Design an enzyme around this catalytic site. Structure first.
Site, short mmCIF file in Angstrom:
data_model
loop_
_atom_site.label_atom_id
_atom_site.label_comp_id
_atom_site.label_asym_id
_atom_site.label_seq_id
_atom_site.Cartn_x
_atom_site.Cartn_y
_atom_site.Cartn_z
N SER A 29 0.82 -1.15 0.00
CA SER A 29 0.00 0.00 0.00
C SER A 29 0.90 1.27 0.00
CB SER A 29 -0.92 -0.12 1.17
OG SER A 29 -1.96 0.81 1.05
N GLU A 62 -10.30 -3.50 -6.04
CA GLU A 62 -9.81 -2.53 -5.09
C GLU A 62 -9.58 -1.17 -5.70
OE1 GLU A 62 -5.89 -2.25 -3.38
OE2 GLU A 62 -5.41 -4.25 -4.23
N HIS A 93 -7.70 -5.29 -1.26
CA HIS A 93 -6.53 -4.64 -0.84
C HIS A 93 -5.74 -5.51 0.05
CE1 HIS A 93 -3.97 -1.28 -0.19
NE2 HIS A 93 -4.10 -1.40 1.12
#
Length: 293
Positions: A143, A234, A264
């Site tokens: 991320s 996502e 995610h």
């Protein structure tokens, strides 16, 4: 295609805060700490300090002597810690048979960009100085931490540092401007805007297209082979398709793999998600592939 993501998507849906509710930073931090998976019991952990940050070497069994992973956790640049990511990182260590360095790098908004980049380069440098050989190194991150992977690479290359053998961004956030399509197209399928407040907090008035903040706009020429995991379902799909397309352009080897029906960083749900366990096996396969070469 999977009964586990169906069960899991409904769980994450029952659990999420209504869209557009303003949660304090200290409230999202603790909540992430409170719900964090516990590392498997056969993962051993050693606390170090690295460039003035707290860190843990996270070693699963089977770990080989020469090798390491600089691992950079997600959390929007504002939250996440060693503790929240110790479980998944144990599993990456398992899969790749290399010890992870799990860095507790500086978080916004107490420490805005480029603080987090400054810590990544410093931990990488610290690894080389311990006499890990670049070709024995990997860098990986989820991320925010997946964009940092890249930011650190570009940054370290600008500074004269040798490139590691591979780099694995998982669900990378590599574009602080948050303008990509998938934010709209892929948003009914993320169980999971709130992410703009985190750009605002990281950036703190900095250029949102600053190569080290948003590595989808950086010169990537010279970086080592990329494996980029992202879920079809996502918000941040586009970041990964555009990271790969820019890597392509800049001379770099990437394999993008969009895993269908995934959310995610689904890897983090390895304990109950079959795709989670297998995406982790595949990361470790790919670092081990790049190390054999």
């Amino acid at each position: 295609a999977g009964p586990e993501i169906v069960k899991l998507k409904k769980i994450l849906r029952e659990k999420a805060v209504p869209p557009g509710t303003e949660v304090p930073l200290d409230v999202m931090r603790k909540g992430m700490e409170k719900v964090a998976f516990k590392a498997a019991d056969d993962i051993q952990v050693e606390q170090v300090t690295v460039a003035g940050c707290a860190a843990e070497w996270v070693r699963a069994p089977g770990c080989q002597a020469g090798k390491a992973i600089l691992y950079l956790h997600g959390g929007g640049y504002v939250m996440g810690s060693i503790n929240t990511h110790r479980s998944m990182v144990g599993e990456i260590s398992r899969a790749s048979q290399a010890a992870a360095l799990l860095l507790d790098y500086r978080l916004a908004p107490e420490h805005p960009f480029p603080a987090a980049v400054e810590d990544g380069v410093a931990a990488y440098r610290w690894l080389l100085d311990q006499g890990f050989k670049p070709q024995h190194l990997s860098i990986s991150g989820d991320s925010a931490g997946g964009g940092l992977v890249l930011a650190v690479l570009v940054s370290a290359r600008d500074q004269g540092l040798p490139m590691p053998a591979s780099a694995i961004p998982i669900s990378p956030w590599a574009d602080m401007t948050c303008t990509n399509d998938s934010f709209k197209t892929r948003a009914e399928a993320d169980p999971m805007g709130g992410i703009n407040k985190m750009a605002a907090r990281y950036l703190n008035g900095a250029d949102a297209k600053h190569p080290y903040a948003s590595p989808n706009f950086a010169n990537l020429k010279g970086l080592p082979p990329l494996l980029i995991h992202v879920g079809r379902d996502e918000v941040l799909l586009d970041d990964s398709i555009k990271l790969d397309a820019k890597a392509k352009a800049d001379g770099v080897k990437s394999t993008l793999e969009i895993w269908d029906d995934m959310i995610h960083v689904w890897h983090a749900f390895h304990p109950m998600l079959p795709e989670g366990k297998q995406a982790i096996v595949r990361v470790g396969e790919f670092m081990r592939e790049q190390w054999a070469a």
